[PDB]
Amino acid sequence: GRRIQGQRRGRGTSTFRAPSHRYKADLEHRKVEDGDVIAGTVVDIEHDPARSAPVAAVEFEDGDRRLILAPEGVGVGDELQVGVDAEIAPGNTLPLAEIPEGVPVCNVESSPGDGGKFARASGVNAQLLTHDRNVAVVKLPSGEMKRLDPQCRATIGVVGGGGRTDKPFVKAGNKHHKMKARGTKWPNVRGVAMNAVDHPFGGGGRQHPGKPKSISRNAPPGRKVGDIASKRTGRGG
RNA sequence: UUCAAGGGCGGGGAGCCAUGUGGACACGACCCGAAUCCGGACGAUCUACGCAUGGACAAGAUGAAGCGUGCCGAAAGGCACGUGGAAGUCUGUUAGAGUUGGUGUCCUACAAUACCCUCUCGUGAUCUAUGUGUAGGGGUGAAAGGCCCAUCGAGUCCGGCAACAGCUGGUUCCAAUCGAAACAUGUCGAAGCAUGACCUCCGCCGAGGUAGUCUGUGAGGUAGAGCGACCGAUUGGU
RNA sequence: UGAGGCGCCCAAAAUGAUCGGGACUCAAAUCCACCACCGAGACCUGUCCGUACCACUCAUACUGGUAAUCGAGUAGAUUGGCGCUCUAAUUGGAUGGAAGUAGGGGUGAAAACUCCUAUGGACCGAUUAGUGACGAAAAUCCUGGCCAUAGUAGCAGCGAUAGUCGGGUGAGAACCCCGACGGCCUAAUGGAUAAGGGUUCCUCAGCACUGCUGAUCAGCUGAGGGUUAGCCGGUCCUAAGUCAUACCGCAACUCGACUAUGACGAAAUGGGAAACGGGUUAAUAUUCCCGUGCCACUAUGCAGUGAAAGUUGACGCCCUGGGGUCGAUCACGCUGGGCAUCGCCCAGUCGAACCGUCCAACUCCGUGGAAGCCGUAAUGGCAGGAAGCGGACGAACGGCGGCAUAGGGAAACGUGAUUCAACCUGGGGCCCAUGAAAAGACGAGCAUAGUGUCCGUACCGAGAACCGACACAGGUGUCCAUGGCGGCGAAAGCCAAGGCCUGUCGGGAGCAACCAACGUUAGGGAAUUCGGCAAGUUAGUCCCGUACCUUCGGAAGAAGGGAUGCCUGCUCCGGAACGGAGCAGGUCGCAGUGACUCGGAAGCUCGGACUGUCUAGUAACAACAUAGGUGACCGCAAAUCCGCAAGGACUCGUACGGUCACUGAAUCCUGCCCAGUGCAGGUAUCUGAACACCUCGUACAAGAGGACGAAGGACCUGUCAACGGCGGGGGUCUUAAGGUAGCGUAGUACCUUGCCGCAUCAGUAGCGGCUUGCAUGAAUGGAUUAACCAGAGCUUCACUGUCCCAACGUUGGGCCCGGUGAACUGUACAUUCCAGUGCGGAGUCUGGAGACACCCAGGGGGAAGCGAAGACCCUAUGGAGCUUUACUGCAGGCUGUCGCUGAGGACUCUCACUCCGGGAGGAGGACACCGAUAGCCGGGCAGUUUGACUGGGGCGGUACGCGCUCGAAAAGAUAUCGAGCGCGCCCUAUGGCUAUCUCAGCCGGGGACCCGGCGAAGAGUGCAAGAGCAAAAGAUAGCUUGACAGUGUUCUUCCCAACGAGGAACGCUGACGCGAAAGCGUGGUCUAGCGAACCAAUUAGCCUGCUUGAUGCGGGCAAUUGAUGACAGAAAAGCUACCCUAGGGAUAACAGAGUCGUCACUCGCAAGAGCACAUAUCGACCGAGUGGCUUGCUACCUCGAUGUCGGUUCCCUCCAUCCUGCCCGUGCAGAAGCGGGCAAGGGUGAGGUUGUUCGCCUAUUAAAGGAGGUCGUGAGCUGGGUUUAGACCGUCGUGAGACAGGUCGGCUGCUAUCUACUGGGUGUGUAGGUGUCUGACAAGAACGACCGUAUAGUACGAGAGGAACUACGGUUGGUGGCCACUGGUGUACCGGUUGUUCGAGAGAGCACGUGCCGGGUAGCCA
Ligand SMILES: [Cl-]
Ligand SMILES: [Cl-]
Ligand SMILES: [Cl-]
Ligand SMILES: [Cl-]
Ligand SMILES: [K+]
Ligand SMILES: [Mg+2]
Ligand SMILES: [Mg+2]
Ligand SMILES: [Mg+2]
Ligand SMILES: [Mg+2]
Ligand SMILES: [Mg+2]
Ligand SMILES: [Mg+2]
Ligand SMILES: [Mg+2]
Ligand SMILES: [Mg+2]
Ligand SMILES: [Mg+2]
Ligand SMILES: [Mg+2]
Ligand SMILES: [Mg+2]
Ligand SMILES: [Mg+2]
Ligand SMILES: [Mg+2]
Ligand SMILES: [Mg+2]
Ligand SMILES: [Mg+2]
Ligand SMILES: [Mg+2]
Ligand SMILES: [Mg+2]
Ligand SMILES: [Mg+2]
Ligand SMILES: [Mg+2]
Ligand SMILES: [Mg+2]
Ligand SMILES: [Mg+2]
Ligand SMILES: [Mg+2]
Ligand SMILES: [Mg+2]
Ligand SMILES: [Mg+2]
Ligand SMILES: [Mg+2]
Ligand SMILES: [Mg+2]
Ligand SMILES: [Mg+2]
Ligand SMILES: [Mg+2]
Ligand SMILES: [Mg+2]
Ligand SMILES: [Mg+2]
Ligand SMILES: [Mg+2]
Ligand SMILES: [Mg+2]
Ligand SMILES: [Mg+2]
Ligand SMILES: [Mg+2]
Ligand SMILES: [Mg+2]
Ligand SMILES: [Mg+2]
Ligand SMILES: [Mg+2]
Ligand SMILES: [Mg+2]
Ligand SMILES: [Mg+2]
Ligand SMILES: [Mg+2]
Ligand SMILES: [Mg+2]
Ligand SMILES: [Mg+2]
Ligand SMILES: [Mg+2]
Ligand SMILES: [Mg+2]
Ligand SMILES: [Mg+2]
Ligand SMILES: [Mg+2]
Ligand SMILES: [Mg+2]
Ligand SMILES: [Mg+2]
Ligand SMILES: [Mg+2]
Ligand SMILES: [Mg+2]
Ligand SMILES: [Mg+2]
Ligand SMILES: [Mg+2]
Ligand SMILES: [Mg+2]
Ligand SMILES: [Mg+2]
Ligand SMILES: [Mg+2]
Ligand SMILES: [Mg+2]
Ligand SMILES: [Mg+2]
Ligand SMILES: [Mg+2]
Ligand SMILES: [Mg+2]
Ligand SMILES: [Mg+2]
Ligand SMILES: [Mg+2]
Ligand SMILES: [Mg+2]
Ligand SMILES: [Mg+2]
Ligand SMILES: [Mg+2]
Ligand SMILES: [Mg+2]
Ligand SMILES: [Mg+2]
Ligand SMILES: [Mg+2]
Ligand SMILES: [Mg+2]
Ligand SMILES: [Mg+2]
Ligand SMILES: [Mg+2]
Ligand SMILES: [Mg+2]
Ligand SMILES: [Mg+2]
Ligand SMILES: [Mg+2]
Ligand SMILES: [Mg+2]
Ligand code: NA
Ligand code: NA
Ligand code: NA
Ligand code: NA
Ligand code: NA
Ligand code: NA
Ligand code: NA
Ligand code: NA
Ligand code: NA
Ligand code: NA
Ligand code: NA
Ligand code: NA
Ligand code: NA
Ligand code: NA
Ligand code: NA
Ligand code: NA
Ligand code: NA
Ligand code: NA
Ligand code: NA
Ligand code: NA
Ligand code: NA
Ligand code: NA
Ligand code: NA
Ligand code: NA
Ligand code: NA
Ligand code: NA
Ligand code: NA
Ligand code: NA
Ligand code: NA
Ligand code: NA
Ligand code: NA
Ligand code: NA
Ligand code: NA
Ligand code: NA
């Protein structure tokens, strides 16, 4: 047959790429020699085309002007701080060690200095539960308990834009406009609506998948489609 | 080979080379004939989808939120009027896009997809110019196996290549002699082969042969007939 | 009363009857005899030829002889010869004329040889031996040329119908030019341009080419000429993105991703230093000239120390205010023009860049001090300080002044206003969407001077300059969107400016038929049709008014009702409009949205929620998408995906993410099943590879075995919004459950037109109810649903030429004429018709009939017409796409092991290595990554296979290897999917031998046993069938292992007649058994019970392995065992309607043909009933037939195609007669019937459901018959159904996909050569003329039928009821003709009237070939 859509994706052609040239900034925690002295002032609040969420423009003491992953509650004029000795207020960034347990956090680093990897989408947040000299236990938005180096930096507060998912798109056109700002091919044709040559579920006198939808983890690309290594399906039980 | 016996193969000197010619096998193999498969290249001037930068949409209708005023109310708010001008909203041959019916005209066309009337959309998932990206078992696809330059259930060009076929077509001067088989055995075999039958030509052998009839010595259970001769059918009566 | 001969009845078919025809009757028939003739290539006979043989011979050279016993022939075998090229030897010809060609003479059976004459003008042979790109009628053969076709089609069709009269030039003028008149184009047919073209531009000279005709013209031909830039573009910048170098990869590169660097990337249409006005050429022009202005750089000078922060460049979508120019319009004046019943109408009234100046909006400052005011179109603003007042900053392509006694104008060379494109500047709203960048500019003064190079520049820009082969009705971007009237309008219609008469052939006929577009049609009004297809109706605006339903938005312009012009005078809103809304009065028409523009409406059902997408080119839909619902995977060093690698997309992303799937808005809901399959988790035990390890083996090694055991599997569990399932039976079984809410004859229901109801005269339709559902059902989503829809079905009102039933007219063709000028097609012949025959579908054969030739027009009956090597079907050891638990492999994932890899069955560490960090350092860590290998998964991908037989193929079957009886025709052989039926073993005895013995069955005496008797065989002998057997081949007893080893002969397998395995018969050699012995035993009494090579194992001995010896382990001779049943041996599944090729009428579907079981009809006999009575009527059984309409069979004809069903239209026919005429019988009173005979003249109609044929139903009727003509009729129509590609449902399948199931959508080519006929001409024959006739023959349905009245309330009859002859009147169908009458048309004509233009008036053009409306003569018509 022919390569399935999931395979056309990997080639990285225009249709599947994100409109990167249209994006604003790569949100990452600033690098501080040490001391924490680094502070800056919020100069403006902008829309982030790559996240459909707000982002904050900050002017730092040493002249640096960078966009920041903005938590909820940050406004023009506010003074944000980044460092070990940073105050403990929303919008500030400091290592999980210096953060008091029980505080909501966002843009958490996977490993100290990577600039932030977890909890960055609209309205989400991580939960610093346990401390230690060796391990900082954080509960990610998926609900997982993650063990992180207490040296991993994070930002106090929940990400701005919460509740975005509460409103329905209502019409195809609205999805369209959002999809145009992401690295995604849309709309989506169902596999069962295709021909056998184009998809493992394609073909037939009526529409239905050929075999069962749960596919093995070991299935090769071109065949791994449907419910991937599903531990279970449906809702019952 | 073999206790043994019995079998197999060979044996009393003709070959080698040359020239012409009959035939076989490999090769293009008497000639043409088609759908393939594979390799390397050339194409996104068409078209699909994405991206960059530009452009386009008479006029009218309906009248969302918001806001105002007035009246009612303790408040909550409610009601009326106005304002406001939303919408993959309506009408619309504005421009522009599309293409339902006529199964009209055309059908050696004006045209290898045209003409006319009718019809759908026309502020949006909109239409469009130019630039730009994705390339062949690969793209692209709101998915019709659609589209990738009149080419698509795997583009185009050249090459492999004089592809192969048991299948169709064709195979060019005169005469004399003989003269079939359309059957049997085997076959992935029944549109084909091989081996026999049968046709023909050459060399050898050297006296019988037997298509006809008669007679003699033998073989035979079909026609017919019959079954108180088997067998099995098949009537009635004392 | 028996028999015979000939005939008769029985006896019906489709274009025109037949015995071949004519025609024949004491025969030209038939039967019995007879006589004479005709008549082949046979037979006889003369001569010759060939072939074979004989004599002679070297001879196959002669000569003679023989053939009664020689003379046909496809495929094929054999043999002699003719012709072509060039070579060689030998030898000739030719300018006193070679070859070739044309015509002609001679020879040879012939291939072919040769001569003569003409032409030709230089080469040409013969013999012998060679040579070979050596011989054509054919291949839908190749190339070239040519005829018919044909002076034919086209040069008409398009909403752009375009010309005409004079004149100019010229050899020549319908189309080249001038004038007038008449028209066409208005977002274009005008103006400016991008791309693209490339000289097409201008001039002169031309017409052989091109130009749909002609041409003096030209985009043609030839020759010259033409494009001028500091301030228009390029150039410069950067965009998506591209390239180059470096690095790395790769076997390698012209290959490849990342990361650096550098460069490239925008001519209309991104950003951007600077130009305006006039003038000029045949052709350029912000480029040249004149005038004026401006920018940048550099130099000089003065000023200036400032100078880089910031601003700008620089930005989305929607609504909106203000500023404001051009344009347009209004008022008034001036200048010029037009008109001439008024006094109107038209044009103009000008003047740049630039320099200077002015400034609304926004923002801000001071003052002020609002507690309710301020302000807007709207939102809004304020004690955090409103209004007012004063001030800073601050706009136009705008105002104003200069520029300008510049320029331009014949002249005047204006002033105000409104609405205001451009341009400027604000306010508001929206985003799960956030709307470039860089160069550059500003910031940052002035004088003077110098410099400003390089590339582009013509023209077209399209119904002739571009792409489409063309001067192609197609395609192709931007700007002018502000010309007038009109009106909502960038709409229509009309008209300016500007352009054009080149969407480039004309002339003629009242101009016929027929065709394309189209107008109008009385009365009826969907009767048409699959279906209202097509056409029509409605229509603009205002007022009134508006149902069910609903997601409260909508439905809605629902529906329905009314109004609408002009003129006179006014009112209101507003600053006003040349803006809008009203009032009163007058008044005309058939009609006031008067043309134009401009909805028909309502209801029920199905589907998909909606806008959107799609098969470029037959499908626009119910299919795809969608929001919404849901499940799955993943914490980012992730999940998913691309790459061989280096690397990469997702990702400037991070679970409110994004990947992978299913369902498909809302509403109410979404039951039961985990057995199978899938996925996932767990797992004592079982299974589970390689390395390392242990044992055996080998001086080593191969190899055998063990221990350990990863993933995986077994096993257990979870999971269905995972694949999917939800029955039979009874008051459980398969296999887990056993169909819940719902819905239901469904787009799913076979039976089926289900039943009931609604509706209609009538309704296979539609809707509602019922519903046992062939075979409904819950995210394979169920039900339901407002809104929406070029989606499917149905109903109503309205409408109407769809129909009854057609007519007239309009325009373009058609027809005739000038000019231009193809194609298709062609074996030949061809004036055919009716029959027959033939490979069964003939212009050509046969018999007849008809037929004088040529030509014009026509509609297409035939040439199984032309077009296409059939798409259907089968066949091929064909192809391809697709599928899967087909075969075999290959990626990829998981997992063990080895290397990298290090220190001290579980553990720590750090040093490689990996990741994070700028670094310091942090995390991880001998793991991971990578390299190698092993096991598991693995249609993700590749290559292939998937057999044959067969009354086509498939399904079924196996007649695919064997044995018997019959078929089988008394030797042998013999077919079918022929009839009956068996074998793929079983047996250590059920083998072998010997001894003893005789069986079934019946009878008699004491179904066991005992005795006797009869008893040739019916018993028994393993198993089919047939055969054999009695002191045995059977039974009993005993003994024995010959069911032995080796090797042959022969037959069979395979008749004849080659062929293996296998089988059998009969020997021998050896060894045995039994018997006194002869002898028997080569398994079972005989015919079924069977298997190659390669490989392995096994048996006994021997041969052999590369210089050699020893050991190990191999190779071989003979043979046994292991299976290929498709059985003389491949290792092997499907779909294709997305399909493709080779072929086949070797083979199916359709038509034909044969048959006639089936079907239709008839006859013989006549049981029977019919109150009695076979035969008024009905009529069984059985028997004999006819037809060729149904069905089936067959496979003859066509697969290089004979176009399907149904319908329609138009023609002919048959009779087995439905009506009509004439008759017979009656269970015939009459009337009304029933049945029958003759008979085919005429008639046999209209409708409702259905694609239907058929059939059901309704009302009429004299009756509403059946059948043939290729199931008549697609070069006639239609296209509803069957049967392409799209899709849905049900069922089946793991799946692709399928269905003798349903459903929505889904194309109709061609210019007529021949023939045929309808009509029209020209000739010839009869044999100069006029007029009038004749009539061989030919055609007709020219007439068919019904109702009514008198007869008559009569005959008949109890009555009820109720005829006839004849004479009349009328109707219907058909037929021919005609137009006084009625009616239609009537783009002759006359009137009314809307819009616009000619100034008004008058009078006119256009509005599609009449603007519309009203009337309508002639003619033509019903
Ligand atoms: Cl999303
Ligand atoms: Cl000869
Ligand atoms: Cl230019
Ligand atoms: Cl405003
Ligand atoms: K055929
Ligand atoms: Mg980032
Ligand atoms: Mg919305
Ligand atoms: Mg995208
Ligand atoms: Mg979808
Ligand atoms: Mg599909
Ligand atoms: Mg597949
Ligand atoms: Mg579905
Ligand atoms: Mg489904
Ligand atoms: Mg392009
Ligand atoms: Mg309003
Ligand atoms: Mg709309
Ligand atoms: Mg519209
Ligand atoms: Mg493009
Ligand atoms: Mg398909
Ligand atoms: Mg010959
Ligand atoms: Mg001869
Ligand atoms: Mg016999
Ligand atoms: Mg007999
Ligand atoms: Mg002969
Ligand atoms: Mg010689
Ligand atoms: Mg031939
Ligand atoms: Mg002709
Ligand atoms: Mg005209
Ligand atoms: Mg010219
Ligand atoms: Mg000239
Ligand atoms: Mg550049
Ligand atoms: Mg520009
Ligand atoms: Mg010019
Ligand atoms: Mg020019
Ligand atoms: Mg033209
Ligand atoms: Mg009428
Ligand atoms: Mg009807
Ligand atoms: Mg009808
Ligand atoms: Mg219609
Ligand atoms: Mg007023
Ligand atoms: Mg009208
Ligand atoms: Mg239905
Ligand atoms: Mg839809
Ligand atoms: Mg199409
Ligand atoms: Mg459509
Ligand atoms: Mg279509
Ligand atoms: Mg759908
Ligand atoms: Mg969804
Ligand atoms: Mg979803
Ligand atoms: Mg019903
Ligand atoms: Mg369910
Ligand atoms: Mg064919
Ligand atoms: Mg087929
Ligand atoms: Mg294949
Ligand atoms: Mg790194
Ligand atoms: Mg495959
Ligand atoms: Mg192959
Ligand atoms: Mg077969
Ligand atoms: Mg015999
Ligand atoms: Mg025997
Ligand atoms: Mg083998
Ligand atoms: Mg063995
Ligand atoms: Mg065989
Ligand atoms: Mg055999
Ligand atoms: Mg074919
Ligand atoms: Mg045949
Ligand atoms: Mg035909
Ligand atoms: Mg009769
Ligand atoms: Mg008749
Ligand atoms: Mg027919
Ligand atoms: Mg007929
Ligand atoms: Mg026909
Ligand atoms: Mg046709
Ligand atoms: Mg035709
Ligand atoms: Mg149809
Ligand atoms: Mg239909
Ligand atoms: Mg249909
Ligand atoms: Mg004559
Ligand atoms: Mg007119
Ligand atoms: Na499927
Ligand atoms: Na192939
Ligand atoms: Na392109
Ligand atoms: Na309101
Ligand atoms: Na159309
Ligand atoms: Na390909
Ligand atoms: Na080739
Ligand atoms: Na082949
Ligand atoms: Na044969
Ligand atoms: Na055969
Ligand atoms: Na064959
Ligand atoms: Na003899
Ligand atoms: Na006989
Ligand atoms: Na022959
Ligand atoms: Na002309
Ligand atoms: Na106007
Ligand atoms: Na729309
Ligand atoms: Na299960
Ligand atoms: Na399961
Ligand atoms: Na079901
Ligand atoms: Na639509
Ligand atoms: Na008409
Ligand atoms: Na014809
Ligand atoms: Na294919
Ligand atoms: Na096979
Ligand atoms: Na044998
Ligand atoms: Na018959
Ligand atoms: Na044919
Ligand atoms: Na028909
Ligand atoms: Na008749
Ligand atoms: Na009917
Ligand atoms: Na036919
Ligand atoms: Na047709
Ligand atoms: Na038809």
Instruction: Please state, in angstroms and rounded to a whole number, the distance separating the CA atoms of residues A227 and A218.
Output: 13
Is it true that the peptide bond before A187 is cis, omega within 30 degrees of 0? yes
**Same-domain pairing of A235 and A213:** yes
Rg (CA), chain A: 22
CATH number, domain containing residue A34 = 2.40.50.140
* CB-contacted nucleotides of strand C (7 Å): 239-241, 432-435, 610-611, 623-637, 639-642, 648-664, 672, 674, 677-681, 718-724, 780-781, 881-885, 891-894, 915-920, 922-923, 937-942, 1288-1299
CATH number, domain containing residue A146 = 2.30.30.30
- Total of domains in chain A: 3
**Same-domain pairing of A105 and A151:** yes
**Same-domain pairing of A133 and A199:** no
**Same-domain pairing of A1 and A72:** yes
Instruction: Please state, in angstroms and rounded to a whole number, the distance separating the CA atoms of residues A57 and A45.
Output: 6
Residue A197: strand, helix, or coil: helix
* Exp. method: X-ray
| Strand-pair category, A53-60 with A65-68 | antiparallel
Q: Show which of A109, A124, A159 is a domain's final residue.
A: A159
Q: What are phi and psi of A21, to 5 degrees?
A: -60, -15
CA distances, A123 to each of A203, A223, A227 (Å):
43, 36, 29
Residue A141: strand, helix, or coil: coil
Instruction: Please state, in angstroms and rounded to a whole number, the distance separating the CA atoms of residues A85 and A82.
Output: 8
Resolution (angstroms) equals 2.4
**Same-domain pairing of A16 and A72:** yes
Q: Show which of A54, A78, A102 is a domain's final residue.
A: A78
Domain range for A35: 1-78
Instruction: Please state, in angstroms and rounded to a whole number, the distance separating the CA atoms of residues A227 and A69.
Output: 34
Burial class (CB in 10 A: 0-12, 13-18, 19+), A188: exposed
CATH number, domain containing residue A215 = 4.10.950.10
